[PDB]
């Protein structure tokens, strides 16, 4: 006779973007002034995710 | 700058319209419900409440 069987192969994943300054220092301007001296820390996170 | 898609952060602030529920302790003393009393005593027999 003839037998059938199925398999699944994953080829993709959900694309996740993160706003780094909104996650860390949400709406508060003092937190943004403090985060501005870590500098190239949110840009590295954004470039890795891109 | 180059041809691209850039993620640009916008903001919103809100300083106004606070609420401040408190569940306060005891009921107000209501001094003014005593100082606006009708029967005012004369300087011989002044009253006092604690
Ligand atoms: C003003 O003070 C007098 C106290 O001199 C209060 O008079 C009381 O009135 C009630 C009425 O039901 C009487 O049962 C009490 O015996 C009275 N007290 C005394 C000590 O006589 C009066 O209520 C006060 N006014 C207000 C608006 O609270």
From Swiss-Prot, chain A:
Originating organism: Human coronavirus HKU1 (isolate N2) (HCoV-HKU1)
General function of this protein: Mediates fusion of the virion and cellular membranes by acting as a class I viral fusion protein. Under the current model, the protein has at least three conformational states: pre-fusion native state, pre-hairpin intermediate state, and post-fusion hairpin state. During viral and target cell membrane fusion, the coiled coil regions (heptad repeats) assume a trimer-of-hairpins structure, positioning the fusion peptide in close proximity to the C-terminal region of the ectodomain.
Entry protein name: Spike protein S2
């Amino acid at each position: 006779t003839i037998a059938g069987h199925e398999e699944f192969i994953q080829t993709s994943s959900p694309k996740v973007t993160i706003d780094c300054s909104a996650f860390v220092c949400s709406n508060y301007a003092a937190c943004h002034d403090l985060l501005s001296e870590y500098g190239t820390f949110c840009d590295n996170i954004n470039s890795i995710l891109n | 700058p180059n041809t691209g898609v850039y993620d640009l952060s916008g903001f919103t602030v809100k300083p106004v319209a606070t609420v401040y529920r408190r569940i306060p302790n005891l009921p107000d003393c209501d001094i003014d419900n005593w100082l606006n009393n009708v029967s005012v005593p004369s300087p011989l027999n002044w009253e006092r409440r604690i």
